[PDB]
Amino acid sequence: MLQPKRTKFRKMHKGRNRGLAQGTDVSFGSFGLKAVGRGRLTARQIEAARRAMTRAVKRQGKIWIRVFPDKPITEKPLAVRMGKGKGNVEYWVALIQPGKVLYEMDGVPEELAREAFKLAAAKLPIKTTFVTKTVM
Amino acid sequence: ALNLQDKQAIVAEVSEVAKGALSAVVADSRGVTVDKMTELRKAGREAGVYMRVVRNTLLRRAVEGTPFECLKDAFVGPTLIAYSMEHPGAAARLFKEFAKANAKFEVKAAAFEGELIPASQIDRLATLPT
Amino acid sequence: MKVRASVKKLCRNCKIVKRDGVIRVICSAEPKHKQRQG
Amino acid sequence: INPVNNRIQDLTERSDVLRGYLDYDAKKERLEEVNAELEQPDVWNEPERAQALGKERSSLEAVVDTLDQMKQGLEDVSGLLELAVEADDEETFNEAVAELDALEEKLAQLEFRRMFSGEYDSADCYLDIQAGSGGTEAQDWASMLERMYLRWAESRGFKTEIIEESEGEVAGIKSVTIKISGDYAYGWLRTETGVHRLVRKSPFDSGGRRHTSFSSAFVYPEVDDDIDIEINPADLRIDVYRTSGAGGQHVNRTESAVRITHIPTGIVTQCQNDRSQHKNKDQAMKQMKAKLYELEMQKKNAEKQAMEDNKSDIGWGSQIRSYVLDDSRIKDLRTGVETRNTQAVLDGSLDQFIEASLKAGL
Amino acid sequence: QAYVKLQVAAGMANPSPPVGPALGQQGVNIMEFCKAFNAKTDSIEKGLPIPVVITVYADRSFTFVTKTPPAAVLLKKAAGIKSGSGKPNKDKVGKISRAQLQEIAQTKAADMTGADIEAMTRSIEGTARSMGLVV
RNA sequence: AGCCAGGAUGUUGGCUUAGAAGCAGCCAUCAUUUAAAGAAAGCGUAAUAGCUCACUGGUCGAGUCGGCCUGCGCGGAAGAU
Ligand SMILES: [Mg+2]
Ligand SMILES: [Mg+2]
Ligand SMILES: [Zn+2]
């Protein structure tokens, strides 16, 4: 489960998740799973996806996780009223914009890679798509 | 397979026909692979690798290469059949071999048509140079 | 009869057919395989 | 080639010993009957039986086959030994030597499997030595035993570690726990569990009478401490309801109280300490977990109790060796092997007993 | 008609433990097959398995035609090793030269389907590779 | 797309296994007779056997296959007078 080792700050503002993503292209691998939807992947979710895809690829070929859950999300404890400071950090998310290459993969046949990505995709909350290495 | 390979195959077949005048038939409408293998091995024993049973007797495959040489072979087309081109020796004895094979379990599929070399009938010709 | 939200061809013999506006997997081979969207 | 000859001589002897321990003829007979059963076509109609019979067969066959291989190989080597000696052909000699080595290895393998067939035999052990009813003498005896064990363990290459030592007020030790790490440590030591009989004139007695003092050894393997598994919400029923007495308007309405129930076992935990239902559930959950743990412990204990009860049933048979120092003779009661070198045994020559015990399977 | 290849070594007269019910499944008796095997054996060699056609006729008197012994055992014999399959590409257990393989090929020519001995040799090489031994 | 035929050889590849013969796995994944036939995709077996499939030959005689892009719809879709 991915999480920042150190932090500058323990809690964080909600913020907004508008715009298009920057990590848009398949950089390292041959194939990628590009996020079509807007949302936020938790660390847990990402880990699950990784687990799904590694198994599918049967420990053959490399996987990159292009996303990182660097934003802490707070949850107020149950049966607790609305005041009294900010809630405690429960889980960590990567905020996802459309265009985000989430995962990358190489050293695999194409069909197999596709299959793996499909398997992964069902674990993630956002709508996603298979993408390829492009010259330029 | 793409067009080019098919064309090449056709050319090869044509070349084979040009090389060898005598020919005979066989058919596997109920034929064991082992028998076929044995038959193939016979050819090897006799002479070179040249001879193939060439199952490609479609309406526009061997029948398309028929206008080049032995023009009567077009009517053979619309049936399950397998040709056998014979290169060395003037009228070899592989024609009756097929008949023999048929006799030893093949359930009369080809009906030993002959391929007409001295313009022969449907019936066999034992009269062959030895 | 597996009534599901996702119906899929589970083998070669599985065929997807639509009957009175309902998606259905019917299979000639395996009776287990036959499905309905619901 | 004299050492080679000696080795050859040894090997036949050990093969014979192995046969004796195995009871080879009976095994062969069993193999034969099983084989006969096998070929009868009616036996494969019953599937459960047949697979079991097959399983039985194979091991027996292996045992038999290896045995005569050993008989034959040795003979071959002996035949070739002459050639090596008189004719002086070197390559042939070398070949013979190689064959012998192979045969030896095979023998070892067979003996290994005969010995260390148990589940925990490869693992390391905790040897526990306890002094008997005697007093000072008993304590001394226990100490002696401990020393002997240490010497033995050092000898073969095991790592000893004195975990706990209760020291005797006058001399020796009241009790000791020794962790013995190494390859097949428990398998080598498991036979030494039991009561040891010292017979000697007591140096601590003022009268100087000849005492029969006892001290127990107890070898148990270091089991891997299994993680206490998280119970599934599928196995659980969570009831929520109103509290007893309560006391107010909000209390009458609110269902804070939690009853967690284990479906497979039938244990219940109630909690209604907190106002918050969630908190109660958490507390109740904890309680349930604790209860489960307790149950697990109880079950473990019960099984353990059965085991010793069975062990108790043997009674006087727990006495495994008799160390007579006056007449100068050690006897293993289980096997029947005797030696007059008592001092040597004390120093740590237990291999002669232990190996035989292992071969026996007791 | 009920033809199946299932037998152990030629020297082992009447295969009781391994084959058993498989040989005596049909109407033909246990003793006959064994006798036939014995008869076959004396002309060539003992110790190796040899496969044979089991055409079980209604008259009981079966027609049988022998085949060449399995290739794997021959390969093993050539090697001088017993087991060489456990993790072959991770670590090479045994190794054979091409000439030896070629030699092996020639002897089996009667039962092998083909005219070219080179073909046979390459088949044998492939078999060896499969087994675990690197050429 | 139907339909008729073949769908083999070394070979049951070895091992480890109780047994393993394409199909418990672990691993190599070759070559052969060549029209084509995986040391095997599914069913099947105590395991073999057996039944399919891949690819291919024959018949038949015009379009066909499955991705992408989008428009509109379908299921997913249960509550209390
Ligand atoms: Mg940004
Ligand atoms: Mg809708
Ligand atoms: Zn189906």
Curated annotation (Swiss-Prot), chain A:
Gene Ontology cellular-component annotations: cytoplasm; cytosolic large ribosomal subunit
InterPro entries: Ribosomal_uL16 (IPR047873), Ribosomal_uL16_bact-type (IPR000114), Ribosomal_uL16_CS (IPR020798), Ribosomal_uL16_dom (IPR016180), Ribosomal_uL16_sf (IPR036920)
Superkingdom field: Bacteria
Pfam family, one: Ribosomal_L16
Residues recorded as bearing N-methylmethionine in the entry: 1
Protein's GO biological process: cytoplasmic translation; ribosomal large subunit assembly
An MF annotation (GO) of this entry: rRNA binding
Transmembrane segment boundaries: none
Residue numbers bearing the (3R)-3-hydroxyarginine modification: 81
The entry's keywords: Hydroxylation, Methylation, Ribonucleoprotein, Ribosomal protein, RNA-binding, rRNA-binding, tRNA-binding
Description of post-translational modifications: Is hydroxylated on Arg-81 by RoxA. The modification is nearly suppressed when E.coli is grown in anoxia.
Family as reported in the entry's similarity comment: Belongs to the universal ribosomal protein uL16 family.
Its biological purpose: Binds directly to 23S ribosomal RNA and is located at the A site of the peptidyltransferase center. It contacts the A and P site tRNAs. One of the last ribosomal proteins to be assembled in the 50S subunit. The simultaneous presence of uL16 and bL36 probably triggers ObgE's GTPase activity and eventual dissociation from the mature 50S ribosmal subunit. It has an essential role in subunit assembly.
Assembly behavior: Part of the 50S ribosomal subunit. Cross-links to the A and P site tRNAs. Interacts with assembly factor DarP(YjgA).
Protein name: Large ribosomal subunit protein uL16
Species this chain originates from: Escherichia coli (strain K12)
Gene that specifies this protein: rplP
Curated annotation (Swiss-Prot), chain C:
Signal peptide: none
One GO BP annotation of this record: translation
Keyword Ribosomal protein found: yes
Gene Ontology MF term list: rRNA binding; structural constituent of ribosome
Ranges that cross the membrane: none
Record has Ribonucleoprotein as a keyword: yes
Any one of the GO CC terms: cytosolic large ribosomal subunit
Keywords: Ribonucleoprotein, Ribosomal protein, RNA-binding, rRNA-binding
Stored InterPro entries: Ribosomal_bL36, Ribosomal_bL36_sp
Family assignment from sequence similarity: Belongs to the bacterial ribosomal protein bL36 family.
Subunit organization: Part of the 50S ribosomal subunit.
NCBIfam families on file: rpmJ_bact
PANTHER family named in the record: 50S RIBOSOMAL PROTEIN L36, CHLOROPLASTIC, LARGE RIBOSOMAL SUBUNIT PROTEIN BL36C
Primary role: One of the last ribosomal proteins to be assembled in the 50S subunit, it contacts a number of helices in the 23S rRNA, acting as molecular glue. The simultaneous presence of uL16 and bL36 probably triggers ObgE's GTPase activity and eventual dissociation from the mature 50S ribosomal subunit.
Protein name per UniProt: Large ribosomal subunit protein bL36A
Gene: rpmJ
From Swiss-Prot, chain D:
Main location per the UniProt record: cytoplasm
Entry GO terms, CC: cytosol
One of the GO BP terms on file: viral translational frameshifting
Pfam families: PCRF, RF-1
PTMs per UniProt: Methylated by PrmC. Methylation increases the termination efficiency of RF2. Is absent when the factor is overproduced.
SUPFAM superfamilies from the UniProt entry: Release factor
An example molecular function term from Gene Ontology annotations: translation release factor activity, codon specific
UniProt function note: Peptide chain release factor 2 directs the termination of translation in response to the peptide chain termination codons UGA and UAA. Acts as a peptidyl-tRNA hydrolase. In the presence of truncated mRNA in the 70S ribosome, ArfA and RF2 interact such that the GGQ peptide hydrolysis motif of RF2 rises into the peptidyl-transferase center (PTC) and releases the ribosome. Recruited by ArfA to rescue stalled ribosomes in the absence of a normal stop codon. A TnaC-stalled ribosome binds RF2, but the active GGQ motif is prevented from engaging with the PTC by TnaC.
Name of the featured protein: Peptide chain release factor RF2
Species of origin: Escherichia coli (strain K12)
Taxonomic path: Bacteria, Pseudomonadati, Pseudomonadota, Gammaproteobacteria, Enterobacterales
Swiss-Prot record, chain E:
N6-succinyllysine PTM positions: 67, 76
Pfam families: Ribosomal_L11, Ribosomal_L11_N
Alphabetized Gene3D superfamilies for the sequence: Ribosomal protein L11, C-terminal domain (1.10.10.250), Ribosomal protein L11/L12, N-terminal domain (3.30.1550.10)
BP-aspect Gene Ontology terms: cytoplasmic translation; ribosomal large subunit assembly; stringent response; translation; translational termination
SMART domains (alphabetical): RL11
Subunit-level organization: Part of the ribosomal stalk of the 50S ribosomal subunit. Interacts with L10 and the large rRNA to form the base of the stalk. L10 forms an elongated spine to which 2 L12 dimers bind in a sequential fashion forming a pentameric L10(L12)2(L12)2 complex.
GO molecular function, one term: large ribosomal subunit rRNA binding
UniProt name for this protein: Large ribosomal subunit protein uL11
Modified positions (N6,N6,N6-trimethyllysine) in chain numbering: 35
Keywords: Methylation, Ribonucleoprotein, Ribosomal protein, RNA-binding, rRNA-binding
Domain of life, source organism: Bacteria
GO cellular component: cytoplasm; cytosol; cytosolic large ribosomal subunit
Family the entry assigns: Belongs to the universal ribosomal protein uL11 family.
Function: Forms part of the ribosomal stalk which helps the ribosome interact with GTP-bound translation factors.
